[model samples]
Target: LELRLKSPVGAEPAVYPWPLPVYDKHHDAAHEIIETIRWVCEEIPDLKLAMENYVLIDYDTKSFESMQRLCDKYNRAIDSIHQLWKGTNTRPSTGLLRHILQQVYNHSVTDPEKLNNYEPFSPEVYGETSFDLVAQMIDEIKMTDDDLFVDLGSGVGQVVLQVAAATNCKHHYGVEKADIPAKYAETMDREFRKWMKWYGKKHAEYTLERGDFLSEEWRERIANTSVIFVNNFAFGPEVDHQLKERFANMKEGGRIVSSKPFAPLNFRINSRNLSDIGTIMRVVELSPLKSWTGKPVSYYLHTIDRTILENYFSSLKNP
Candidate 1:
């Protein structure tokens, strides 16, 4: 297996996302590649290298920039190289397994027309959240195998599992709130975990809850979770009114990534919430993501502020 760890130009080992980094400039130079190859071979043991290009191979010659001018371009360049290759690398145990599983499960949907009915799955209810969107979402957030993730109105639970496979969020959960979708999410969750184990990809603990979101008896989990993903859909108003108090006290630095704006502020005004409405969450737009919808999907990333409820109102009008 040691002989398998070769790049076209070299062999080495590498962090952060821990899996599928291929390589990064982490502490500088080849250590990034060396350390990663070590984990891929020994740490996970089961992660196979189908070929060379599967590893990102960012292990090029190093350069030095002015200490005074450490800038966004530098930052952007570093990030670009960290992205794992989604195509090629047909090896089953490596990153390819994760992408294939997602595609297979999504395509396994029985009723084609029912896909459009998921309330929060805008543009196309029948649509699976595209890999590009999920990757962009993963890139925009800070996550670890130690963090907990809960998806509100999780559809087929695709994004939740995808993030778990790619980035390493240790605990994964989906609260569908509606019975039918909830059932589907749970069913798919079972298939996901079963295959993940077979693929030798074991890390995240999971739970799939069924019932109501705004009116549920069990929602204390959100207050301590590291990341919360929501598809507010047209129900943004419904979620906003009741969820502000719940979010008012989430873990510090915890994130809420949502498809639509949450709470009452003013996008028409195109500014911050001045009327004291909504939780103390700060809104940040993520880079637009490519989608099967043939258009880019826009999402908002929110940092949960320790302070809660200035004038928290409807989700529709807010972040």
Candidate 2:
């Protein structure tokens, strides 16, 4: 009993035992490996041009030597491209990162459970930040290795994983309060590491933990984080207000990326709104930031700066 995995380049097939290898309770390694190889070909234009469509062809599963050879061939192809890219020390293309993430989620998440759970626009409704938007954020923010990143309300650790892979942030954290997604985050964490290694890619240290970002412990954590990403479009106004209170505690020059603006972009520093978060932070909108829903979303980038409030006070004193 064996399964034949054809290569896109029309090479000798990769054969594994019929059942394939399961990496965890939910995920199997065979399809993910096959998908990785396929994408590897797609990532390299030369490989894409040289390779033919991969289709299953029966090979002797019992023959370990040939199987090893075939597997090594694919591995070498994938490795060569990765090493070539690594030699240049540039970030991976969005296409490759997207493929890695999709494969990770495909294996990590249980379709039945995810599809059956959650309603649209609900507080815990599952949604993903698109890779394109993340890429833009990575480019725009330009995080250094000294920075610490956190994804508040992170769902299954998608944004954190992407940022970890793309940037040199010292560490990344994803905190999710929901039960189902947080449960899946466990699998996502394991699968993401496994897949990233399988593809020979490197990512900064990261953690996906089950906790409320609004909790007292996270209050201090949020304040200290150099960069924070929050997909808060579905959050209630109360939650947003609480988040703003936490943001107010952040140190000078901390940056927040959120789907919903915490304050008005055209915030006027007046006596009436003196106590507002907008008075202490600079909020700018990045337009056409998309998500899984294909909607033209806007993402708000807020920098923790008290200069606005200081200037206001000084102006009042002078006047």
Candidate 3:
């Protein structure tokens, strides 16, 4: 087991409590400081300068709102750090971090025997969403800094961390039902936090809940998020209806991405699916993906439209 930091005490936590986008302005100020630290850490190559620059921000500005002279001082201090990265050879993501993690995963998780024994899909392994595709998705979604992002069945927490870190989004939540993937993802997230801290950057806030996604607790999370992404690999046919109802009540204008479309129902009289997806969501993209085994699959992108809550006419007359 690795040692965990009970309290860093060096820098403040990179997170805010729930109910954000409520006081998003204040929250985003905190987020920016955190983002700055992370960006500096990612960009700065010299370890000593990186850590020193991170601390300098706090040392200079731990008190009160900006006074004119104090603001000048803070700007000078931050500017020096920026100058170093700008003029220096330092750069982020030579991609060493990803490779390091991938190495560990390959060492332990690559074995089909060990992987299967870990949880559900024994011989089947989960892969990260394509990097290029994720970049495209980020541009397409045009996420604001304060929006909430959810990844149901977050295997190893790749998309969850990527979404939070890349865009500096306010909050990210990942729900995984298995012990192996859940713990693994949690550990990786923890490592990411430490990675930011080591370079003295502010890590973005994200949560990994290792439990069934069907419970009341998780349902509330889905409703609150602005964007939701799901993987259909471990799911069953029953999920289509469950999601149909789950999303039906969701506040309109939300967005969803998934491997399987919970084909809408409101069409047929006998088997009236409550949230007819076709009516409620506009098609965004259907990008193909590297599917499990040798089969093919596509990641469906969609954004919710005007409310099509079924039984509008029925509610008018019967009620």
Candidate 4:
């Protein structure tokens, strides 16, 4: 990493740790010669300077401190450069990396069959579904005849597809922000529609939109929906606020389901928290919004509440 050289005044030139031996008879003269050579070498901007420019005459007082500081600073700079190289070199495989991985694996990235039949619908990243949480949520909310299922930030429309397949909801909608994911969602929707036709079941009209959900126009379009589902991990406080405002406009008895139980919308309620239940899908529900710790908190599954959601949003908004 870093190197530092220290020369003490009036000490034997032999005691100095310079790369070259100090040949002068006087120790001070030897030190001066070494310092001059160091300065000249450092004048070349790209040359690796062994230590900082400062010299300490007080060998007993600040020699170790100065040397240590210089070494630490240089090492830190080197480590930071190494870290940058690591990050730039290693990313989620794309382009050549994607092609190479596929060539080796013989399938598309995130393909379930290639990924050991892992259902991509599960919360475990690359997992397959046995007991679908969104399906269950649809069933729970549909008892009241709710007709719409909205999945915010619906990646690849997995949740939306699951809900549509399991329930007879009038419409299943997915809001996606990224272009690639939105295209994937569209692809999945078409496949799901074909599957529905073969089963002789009326497919729920599924729609996937690519844009920010925080926009007022988009919020207005989904305001009257009966059930809203959010996968909360990706959304920050600003997006969370928009979701909350949209949820507020929903008709009475409307429900918002989330894979991650805690969200800013449920920040006020005190008596509820998220329960794992150890199912295939890690899903939770927020029933109502209430005040906790001087802010509104959302409840998941009408049971669990968490202060973490409130604190998270507060830190984001404040900071």
Candidate 5:
């Protein structure tokens, strides 16, 4: 049977940094292209089988050559799709995609390879929280107006800003070791004050500092705080131990909202109570063994008992 096979044709590949309307329109166009490609593949018998098996071949040597040419044509069609979507060499008002592509491609080809390992702070790397999480924690813990809130490793002041914005607490403080991020955090706080002014709210009563949380100064500052929010990842075990040590002298209602629990303090707090709290907080103890990469990763909310926290501080000798 004589059969005709051809590559599919449709819309271009959607590029990034697209304006809202253009992005939506181009995305729809891509969908149309994909549908057309699927339709063409389904309509031709030999072509259908080849595609299904992911094997490209022909009945005869000449036919094979012709099929090979068709493959190139198909690839060109795909390239056209990207070009159209990206507007690579298009007319006036080419999309941001084109500009971004130029930047990327031009840098790669023209510039000498420089180690970007020392790249500066980027908000994209450390995800920014809505601060709503801190608000929720405050409400859940029944934090009193007299409670002082401290955020350790507070980057860009999101946690501190949110706390100040939401509640009328005795104090709000954020400690950040990184200078650049601390500066940004201060700027954000100032901006937040402007926003608060518009809302006719009280100014943010908080302190953002450029200092390490592991230092004695931070510990001393936190001694009076009833509520401490620690966002430090796995690297702050010493800080956790120190905090637990300090918690002993804290007021009876004091609590800590940590991203992860201090395992060493497990003996003091009851495992059951900790587990209940951990469950409510969606805490997970990530480990590398459980991950596909088999690297030290965080464990999702696993059971932690209140006795753990209790025992943790009890075991620590007061300094």
Candidate 6:
């Protein structure tokens, strides 16, 4: 069995073996690559005008020379069109960016069995923030070139990749403690660079590492990050408390997005709660969030605000 992706733009088709390799129970690489092509075409109107809107399949095997010719035909067409994008600094559209990220994930996370081998309901149980939700968070945060970004418990560095491509943050980092995702992150880093280059795209600098976010080394690093992302829905109370401790150290105006709130939305600084994280930060809930699980998930966005505490102190002194 074989798959042939045809192009309408006078380019040769992209060919692949049939029954494309699966990443998890839900996704496959061939379909992902097709989506990537579709989105790239959508992002560049000229490419769409020139490219084919249909895909082809061949049940019988063809000669190697014929296959090579067909493959080279489409690549050249794609490349020539890509050349027009040179010297442009435009960021990819959401659809195109998602496609690129899905392709990178499909290529890097090769061992689906290994990825799914973990026990259920454990901290290592893997889940990812979908591209749509991440994109919404990106818009809400509105990071600039001076900001530094970090994703705690980054699974295969997907969020890091998305944010790096979407924003101009000075640097992005993904830190994961799990053995499987961390190892896969290494490949994700390489594949991201390769695919982004292949697509003629640009991204801010990023890094993925296998390390515990709660470790002593990360305390200072976490404090310094201007924007942080964490899917903490599964975290227990103890982990949540420790995380709040770290957030307390962040510089004023630092932002955090998490599946669970570290502090109450209506936190007040009373004498008894003076040392609490709520006194030093403001937290708001963003509604209508949906993740891989398809639950009615709402994310919490927190901003470090010493002024909240400062105002409280001034009021007490004046009163």
Query: All models: lDDT?
Result: 0.52, 0.73, 0.53, 0.45, 0.46, 0.74
The clash number for model 6 is: 7
Cα distance off (Å), candidate 6, residue 55? 5.9
State the weakest 10-residue window (summed lDDT) of model 5.
89-98
Off by over 4 Å in 1: 1-99, 102-108, 113-129, 263-279, 289-294, 306-319
Residue 297 CA displacement from its true place in model 3, Å: 6.3
Q: Estimate each model's TM-score.
A: 0.56, 0.75, 0.57, 0.44, 0.44, 0.79
Off by over 4 Å in 3: 1-113, 117-129, 199-203, 264-275, 288-297, 307-319
Clashing pairs in 2: 8-52, 9-51, 9-52
Predictions ranked by lDDT, top down?
Answer: 6, 2, 3, 1, 5, 4
Model 4, 1-319: lDDT tens digits are: 2224221111111122424232223223234333423432333232233334553232222244444454444444434444555688112111222112112121112333322224344322322232233333554566233477677787666666555545667777889887766665665665455433322234456787787777777777666766677767556877666665565455544555665553433243233432221211122543323221222333354222233445545666898
- Residue 89, model 5: lDDT of 13
Q: Write the per-residue lDDT of candidate 1 for residues 164-192, one digit (tens) a residue.
A: 66666677887775555666676577666
Q: In model 2, where is the ten-residue run with the lowest total lDDT?
A: 120-129
Model 5: per-residue Cα lDDT at residue 134? 39
> Tens digit of lDDT per residue, candidate 5, span 34-144?
333344344334335444232233222234344344444444544554355576511111122122222222212221222122333223222222222333454555545
Root-mean-square deviation of Cα positions for candidate 3 versus the true structure, in angstroms: 14.4
lDDT of each residue in 1-319, candidate 3, tens digit only: 1111111223432332222112122222333333434444444444324343434345322233322233334334455665665787111252533332332243233323433445532212322335434544666678787688888887677667656656666888888887877867756676666545544434357897798877887677777778888866457768765775667556677888876655532333223544355656655446534233323435666666644444554565698
- Candidate 2: list runs displaced more than 4 Å: 2-35, 42-91, 115-129, 289-294
Instruction: For residues 1-319, write the lDDT of model 2, one tens digit per residue.
Output: 5655443333444455645555445446564555556676655676554333442143333455544455565655545554566788244567777867876676666454453335433212222446666777788899998999999877777888889888888899999888887888899888777666654567889999999898999889998999999878878989988999999999999999998888899999998988899999999998654333454666889999999999999998998
> Candidate 6 regions off by >4 Å?
1-27, 43-73, 79-89, 116-129, 288-295
- The most accurate candidate by TM-score is 6
Which candidate, 1 or 2, has the higher lDDT? 2
Worst 10 residues of 1 by lDDT: 1-10
